[PDB]
Ligand binder design. Structure first.
Ligand SMILES: *[C@@H]1O[C@H](CO)[C@@H](O[C@@H]2O[C@H](CO)[C@@H](O[C@@H]3O[C@H](CO[C@H]4O[C@H](CO[C@H]5O[C@H](CO)[C@@H](O)[C@H](O)[C@@H]5O)[C@@H](O)[C@H](O[C@H]5O[C@H](CO)[C@@H](O)[C@H](O)[C@@H]5O)[C@@H]4O)[C@@H](O)[C@H](O[C@H]4O[C@H](CO)[C@@H](O)[C@H](O)[C@@H]4O)[C@@H]3O)[C@H](O)[C@H]2NC(C)=O)[C@H](O)[C@H]1NC(C)=O
Ligand SMILES: *[C@@H]1O[C@H](CO)[C@@H](O[C@@H]2O[C@H](CO)[C@@H](O)[C@H](O)[C@H]2NC(C)=O)[C@H](O)[C@H]1NC(C)=O
Ligand SMILES: *[C@@H]1O[C@H](CO)[C@@H](O)[C@H](O)[C@H]1NC(C)=O
Length: 499
C-alpha cells in the first residue's frame, strides 16, 4: 500500500520528537539540527536549521552568554522538546546546544519569534540524549501562563534544576521568557537534585518520559535510579497548575503486573479518553482522562532493557484518589514523607487539622510528599517476542483503540475490553520494512483518519482503518477492528461513514 512518507535528508540528522497541529494538520518534526514543518500528506515545506554550531559541553555559563576558554567543536543540536503552544499560536523547541537553548518559533514559517535572555538560568540542560526531557505548557485563563519542565541534569545539580516551572509570557518580545515563576532566596518554582544524593548514588539522575495537563494538575512520569544490583523506579509526579512555591509536590511509584510477572520500567505513555468498556471498568465518566503506558519486566538495567513489555491503563481518578489518601493519612501523623532522593533523610509526617479537599494544593508542611506503595495499573496486553516502545490511543465509537510500536518497527492495534479479558490485539502492521525502532512520539491527523508514526530515519502516515483487506462478511465482522462495518449497497468491508 502507498503510505505517505518523509525520509531524513541526512544519515546523521535523525528524528527526535513529533507533534501535529490539531486544527491545521501541520506536521512539525523535531530532528537533529532541523525542525521541519510538513503538510498533512508529509510533503516537505519549511526546513529549519538549528545546527550544527560552535559549542563545547564544558562551557558554562554557555557560549551565548559569555566567551569560554575551551576547545570548541562543531556540535549537533538534538531536539529535546517540541510543544505547540496553542493559546499564543507559536511553536516551542529546545535543544542540546549551549547548555539547553529554548527558542519560541513561529507556526507559519518557523521564524524565531523570541530569543530567551542571556541570563544563564534560561538554559535548561547540557544533556544531549533524547527521551530525558518533557514539558507541559499550562495557560489556564487569566494569567500569562507557564511552562512546566522536567529534564535530566547529568550530575550538574547546581546548573540545572530537575523540574521547574518557567514563565512563558504573552508578549512575545518580553524578557520574562523562561524565568522561574518564582525566585526568592529559598522558595522558588524549582526542585534541585541535592548534592547529598548525587554522592550517595553513582550516576544518579531523573529521566522524564511524559507529562500532561489534567484538571487542576500537572503530571510528570519519571524513571530514576533508587536510593539504597541496579534498582530503578518509575514514578508519577503531581503538581497543582497554580502552585509556585512547589508545595503541592507528591510522588508515587507506578507500574502494572499480569500473570505473576511484574512490569516497572516506563518506556512510554500517552493520555487519552477512556473506552466505553474501560469507562465501566474504572467507574469514571467518558469525559475523564486515562493514561496509557508501556513497561518493561522488573526494575533492572533501564539502559539495556529486556523484551517482556506490557501496555496498561491508569485512570487519573485512581491516581488522584490514591494520592488523596496518601496525603490524608500523612496529615494524621501516619507514616513518613518517604522521598529520600530529595529529602536526604527521614521526615515524620506532621499531624495537622487540615482537610484534604478534592483539590488541595499543599502547605509548607508534609512536602514534598512521596510514598512506597505503587499505583497499580490495569494491564491490557503483554508480549516477550517483541519489545514495546511507543503508545497512542483514541476512542472510535465507544471502543478505545490503542496503537503500540515495537523495537522491530511494528504497530499493533489493540482494542481494550477490560476485565477479565484486558485487550485483544486484533491486527499487526509492519511500518519500517527493515525493522527500525518506533519512537515514543505518535499523533493523529486532525480528524483521526491517520496516525503519524516515526523511526530514527523515517516518518510515515499510517491510516487507522484498512478494512478493505477483509473481503467477505465472514472475515469483516470477525477481526474486531472497531471501525469496520460490513457494507450493504457496496458489497465490501470498510468504515461506517463511507457506506
Ligand atoms: C462502581 O461503583 C459501584 C456502585 O458503587 C460498585 O458496585 C458496588 O460495590 C460495592 C462494594 O464492592 C457493593 O457493596 C457490597 O454490598 C454487599 C451487599 O450487596 C447486596 O445488596 C445491595 C443492596 O441491596 C438492597 O437494595 C436492592 C435494590 O437494588 C434490593 O433489591 C435489596 O433487597 C436490598 O434492599 C444490592 O444492590 C446488591 O445487588 C447488586 O450487586 C450484585 C453484586 O454484588 C449484583 O450481582 C446484583 O445484580 C445487584 O446489581 C447486593 O445483592 C455487602 O454485603 C458488602 O459489604 C461488605 O463489604 C463492605 C466493604 O468492605 C463492608 O462495609 C461490609 O461490612 C461487608 O464486609 C458490600 O458493601 C455494592 O453492592 C455494589 N453496588 C451495586 C449497585 O452493584 C462497583 O464495585 C464499582 N465498579 C467497579 C468496577 O469497581
Ligand atoms: C553527545 O555529546 C557527546 C560528547 O559528550 C558526543 O560523544 C562524542 O562523540 C565524538 C564523535 O562524534 C567522540 O569523538 C567523543 O569521544 C565523544 N565524547 C564523549 C564524552 O563521549 C555525542 O556524539 C553526542 N551525541 C549526539 C547524538 O550528538
Ligand atoms: C501532498 O499534497 C499537497 C497539498 O497539500 C501537494 O501540494 C503535494 O504535492 C502532495 N505531495 C506528494 C508527495 O504527492
Amino acid at each position: 500500500p502507498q503510505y505517505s512518507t518523509f525520509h531524513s535528508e541526512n544519515r546523521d540528522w535523525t528524528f527526535n520528537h513529533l507533534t501535529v497541529h490539531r486544527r491545521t494538520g501541520a506536521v512539525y518534526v523535531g530532528a537533529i539540527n532541523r525542525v521541519y514543518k510538513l503538510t498533512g500528506n508529509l510533503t516537505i515545506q519549511v526546513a529549519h536549521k538549528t545546527g550544527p554550531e560552535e559549542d563545547n559541553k564544558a562551557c558554562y555559563p554557555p557560549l551565548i552568554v559569555q566567551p569560554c576558554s575551551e576547545v570548541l567543536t562543531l556540535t549537533n543540536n538534538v531536539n529535546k522538546l517540541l510543544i505547540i503552544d496553542y493559546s499564543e499560536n507559536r511553536l516551542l523547541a529546545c535543544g542540546s546546544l549551549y547548555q539547553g537553548v529554548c527558542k519560541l518559533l513561529r507556526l507559519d514559517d518557523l521564524f524565531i519569534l523570541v530569543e530567551p535572555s542571556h541570563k544563564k538560568e534560561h538554559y535548561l540542560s547540557s544533556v544531549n540524549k533524547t527521551g530525558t526531557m518533557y514539558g507541559v505548557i499550562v495557560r489556564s485563563e487569566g494569567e500569562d501562563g507557564k511552562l512546566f519542565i522536567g529534564t535530566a541534569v547529568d550530575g550538574k545539580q547546581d546548573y540545572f534544576p530537575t523540574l521547574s516551572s518557567r514563565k512563558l509570557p504573552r508578549d512575545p518580545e518580553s524578557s520574562a521568557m523562561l524565568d522561574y515563576e518564582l525566585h526568592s532566596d529559598f522558595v522558588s518554582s524549582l526542585i534541585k537534585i541535592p548534592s547529598d544524593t548525587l554522592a550517595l548514588v553513582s550516576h544518579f539522575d531523573i529521566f522524564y518520559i511524559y507529562g500532561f495537563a489534567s484538571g487542576g494538575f500537572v503530571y510528570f512520569l519519571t524513571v530514576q535510579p533508587e536510593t539504597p544490583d541496579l534498582f530503578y523506579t518509575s514514578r508519577i509526579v503531581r503538581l497543582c497548575k497554580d502552585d509556585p512555591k512547589f508545595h503541592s509536590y507528591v510522588s508515587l511509584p507506578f507500574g502494572c503486573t499480569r500473570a505473576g510477572v511484574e512490569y516497572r520500567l516506563l518506556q512510554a505513555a500517552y493520555l487519552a479518553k477512556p473506552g466505553e468498556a474501560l469507562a465501566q471498568a474504572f467507574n469514571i465518566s467518558s469525559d475523564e482522562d486515562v493514561l496509557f503506558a508501556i513497561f518493561s519486566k522488573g526494575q533492572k538495567q533501564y539502559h539495556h532493557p529486556p523484551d517482556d513489555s506490557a501496555l496498561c491503563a491508569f485512570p487519573i481518578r485512581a491516581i488522584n484518589l490514591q494520592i488523596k489518601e496518601r496525603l490524608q493519612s500523612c496529615y494524621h501523623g501516619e507514616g513518613n514523607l518517604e522521598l529520600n532522593w530529595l529529602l536526604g533523610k527521614d521526615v515524620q509526617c506532621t499531624k495537622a487539622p487540615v482537610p484534604i479537599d478534592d483539590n488541595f494544593c499543599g502547605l509548607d508542611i508534609n512536602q514534598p510528599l512521596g510514598g512506597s506503595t505503587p499505583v497499580e495499573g490495569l494491564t491490557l496486553y503483554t508480549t516477550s517476542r517483541d519489545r514495546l516502545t511507543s503508545v497512542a490511543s483514541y476512542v472510535y465509537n465507544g471502543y478505545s483503540v490503542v496503537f503500540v510500536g515495537t523495537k522491530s518497527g511494528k504497530l499493533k492495534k489493540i482494542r481494550a475490553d477490560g476485565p477479565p479479558h484486558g485487550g485483544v490485539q486484533y491486527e499487526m502492521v509492519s511500518v519500517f520494512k527493515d525493522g527500525s525502532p518506533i519512537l515514543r512520539d505518535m499523533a493523529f491527523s486532525i480528524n483521526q483518519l491517520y496516525l503519524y508514526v516515526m523511526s530514527e530515519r523515517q516518518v510515515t502516515r499510517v491510516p487507522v482503518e484498512s478494512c478493505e483487506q477483509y473481503t467477505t462478511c465472514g472475515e469483516c465482522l470477525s477481526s474486531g477492528d472497531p471501525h469496520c462495518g460490513w457494507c450493504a449497497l457496496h458489497n465490501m468491508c470498510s468504515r461506517r461513514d463511507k457506506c
